[PDB]
Amino acid sequence: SDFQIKLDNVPSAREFKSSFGSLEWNNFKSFVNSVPDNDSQPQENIGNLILDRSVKIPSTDFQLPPPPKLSMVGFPLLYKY
Amino acid sequence: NRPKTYFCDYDGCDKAFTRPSILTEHQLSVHQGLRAFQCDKCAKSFVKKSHLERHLYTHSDTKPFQCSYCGKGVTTRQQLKRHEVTHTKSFICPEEGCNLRFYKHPQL
Amino acid sequence: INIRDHLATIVEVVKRSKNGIRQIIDLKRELKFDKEKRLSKAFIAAIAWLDEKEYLKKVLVVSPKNPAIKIRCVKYVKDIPDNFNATDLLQNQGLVMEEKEVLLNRFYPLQNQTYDIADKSGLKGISTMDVVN
Ligand SMILES: [Zn+2]
Ligand SMILES: [Zn+2]
Ligand SMILES: [Zn+2]
Ligand SMILES: [Zn+2]
């Protein structure tokens, strides 16, 4: 099985799951109305936009979402020391 | 009793407190790095009146708790209880059904 | 207390706050500028100056269930070269951030006007602060 990353307490992942995964219209409006028409600070951490504090996250974490395949091989490599 | 409903805001801090002065004591002590009670006899400093009071006894021979068996002086009830428990047959044979009891752990 | 030395501390404290946001009433409470009205005035002036000089931004946050319960907060921007503590409410999702930029009908009596808005507001009711405002 590939490297597994847990997003249960990542603020933007919760907003995505609760909107694009749930298809709840109240959540979807709230989400799109929050997307800026243009972004003035694309260099700064997404946490500055997503205020939610119910989740413990360090400000060193940029909420970078994980890739769809981390282990580029399905079988162990032949290092053998 | 009353619910913890004053939350520390700093990056990477988890704590919540009952009454807002206590949240401020935490913030000035942990996050800002300031303390409010200085030792008269050495360089150290403390976050509470009761903590400076304990430290003040450490510079003195007339320590505030006194042993009931040997008469040795100590600064707080925990130290007294542990010390006085050395003046007891504290240790017990851990093996099945064996009756004996001991004063110093190397004897057991 | 000389506020001119503390401006750097106010910016660094907001910079170190979760997501760069701090309630202004809670910030006053941390630095203990709540002990005297003299200190209060100094603090409000300092926050305003940092906002005008663009080191911080005054912003509102609105309770998702109550548009009248809004929190006055400072947002961090760049480095230096209504009074209830809402640190409870800031724990929720609470994502309704807003960066800062009267119905009175003469002909019907005031009684019927408070009645009509108390009816139109539905089963959720309306607060006195909504009605008066
Ligand atoms: Zn803290
Ligand atoms: Zn000392
Ligand atoms: Zn003793
Ligand atoms: Zn035995």
Swiss-Prot record, chain A:
Sequence repeat residues: 58-76
Subcellular location: Nucleus
Role description: TFIIIC mediates tRNA and 5S RNA gene activation by binding to intragenic promoter elements. Upstream of the transcription start site, TFIIIC assembles the initiation complex TFIIIB-TFIIIC-tDNA, which is sufficient for RNA polymerase III recruitment and function. Part of the tauA domain of TFIIIC that binds boxA DNA promoter sites of tRNA and similar genes. Participates in the interconnection of tauA with tauB via its contacts with TFC3 and TFC6. Serves as a scaffold critical for tauA-DNA spatial configuration and tauB-DNA stability.
Note: Present with 15800 molecules/cell in log phase SD medium.
Quaternary data: Component of the TFIIIC complex composed of TFC1, TFC3, TFC4, TFC6, TFC7 and TFC8. The subunits are organized in two globular domains, tauA and tauB, connected by a proteolysis-sensitive and flexible linker. Interacts with TFC3, TFC4 and TFC6.
Family as reported in the entry's similarity comment: Belongs to the TFIIIC subunit 5 family.
Name listed for the protein in its UniProt record: Transcription factor tau 95 kDa subunit
Gene: TFC1
Curated annotation (Swiss-Prot), chain B:
Source organism, top-level taxon: Eukaryota
Molecular-function GO terms, alphabetical: DNA-binding transcription factor activity, RNA polymerase II-specific; RNA binding; RNA polymerase II cis-regulatory region sequence-specific DNA binding; RNA polymerase II sequence-specific DNA-binding transcription factor recruiting activity; RNA polymerase III type 1 promoter sequence-specific DNA binding; zinc ion binding
GO CC annotations, alphabetized: nucleoplasm; nucleus
Residue intervals of every C2H2-type zinc finger in the record: 6-31, 37-59, 65-87, 91-108
Keywords assigned: DNA-binding, Metal-binding, Nucleus, Repeat, RNA-binding, Transcription, Transcription regulation, Zinc, Zinc-finger
Major site of localization recorded for this protein: nucleus
GO biological process terms held by the UniProt record: 5S class rRNA transcription by RNA polymerase III; regulation of DNA-templated transcription
Record's subcellular location: Nucleus
Other information: Present with 1380 molecules/cell in log phase SD medium.
Stated role: Interacts with the internal control region (ICR) of approximately 50 bases within the 5S RNA genes, is required for correct transcription of these genes by RNA polymerase III. Also binds the transcribed 5S RNA's.
This protein's name: Transcription factor IIIA
Taxon lineage: Eukaryota, Fungi, Dikarya, Ascomycota, Saccharomycotina
Portion of the full-length sequence here: 44 to 151 of 429
Swiss-Prot record, chain C:
Subcellular location: Nucleus; Mitochondrion
Domain of life: Eukaryota
Record note on what altering residue 125 to E does: In TSV115; thermosensitive. Level of TFIIIC and its affinity for tDNA reduced. tDNA binding activity very sensitive to mild heat treatments, and TFIIIC-DNA interaction inhibited at moderate salt concentrations
Role of this protein: TFIIIC mediates tRNA and 5S RNA gene activation by binding to intragenic promoter elements. Upstream of the transcription start site, TFIIIC assembles the initiation complex TFIIIB-TFIIIC-tDNA, which is sufficient for RNA polymerase III recruitment and function. Part of the tauB domain of TFIIIC that binds boxB DNA promoter sites of tRNA and similar genes. TFC3 is essential for cell viability. Cooperates with TFC6 in DNA binding.
Misc remark: Present with 125 molecules/cell in log phase SD medium.
Subunit structure: Component of the TFIIIC complex composed of TFC1, TFC3, TFC4, TFC6, TFC7 and TFC8. The subunits are organized in two globular domains, tauA and tauB, connected by a proteolysis-sensitive and flexible linker. Interacts with TFC1, TFC4 and TFC6.
Protein name: Transcription factor tau 138 kDa subunit
Species this chain originates from: Saccharomyces cerevisiae (strain ATCC 204508 / S288c)
Section of the entire sequence shown: 183 to 357 of 1160
